[PDB]
Nucleic acid binder design. Sequence first.
RNA 1: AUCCUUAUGCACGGGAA
RNA 2: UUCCCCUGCAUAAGGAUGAACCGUUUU
Length: 133
Amino acid sequence: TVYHCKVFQFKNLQNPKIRFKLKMNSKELSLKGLCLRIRDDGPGIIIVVGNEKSCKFYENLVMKRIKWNEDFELHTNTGDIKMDMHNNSISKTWEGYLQDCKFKGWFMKVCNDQDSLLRTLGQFDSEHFYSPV
RNA sequence: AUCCUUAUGCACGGGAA
RNA sequence: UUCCCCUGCAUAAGGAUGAACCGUUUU
């Protein structure tokens, strides 16, 4: 059993509407994998492992349907904040086939440094999908 | 998960024998 | 007690298609 796989990378993920869309669409499509980023305000990586149709649909999702370029408003304990998303982007670094994924479920972490991010990818032998910095 | 159509069961109202 | 009509609830069959402020996971 081999599974389709895609790998993406984003400059910023702070918009909760997105992060919601990401998690929900991962579980609803039975995609395995993960989504990481270095610190809340950081850039990171998405990996989706699944059947073709799910991965193509999710690709269409992240690429075509979600507009990461548009600014938003972060509701806060203190009051709204004008959140600048004009300098955001998402691209696909990989796609192909994987013999077996040590990926169990799907989750969305936030790593301290880049090293922690690597190691986290190193649990699942995927560090090789990260184009650092 | 939502809409519509068909079939069945239960409850209420109106009319006939 | 039977028949006819309207409204509400549950089950089954068939056809068509969306949203959702949320982080190691609550198919």
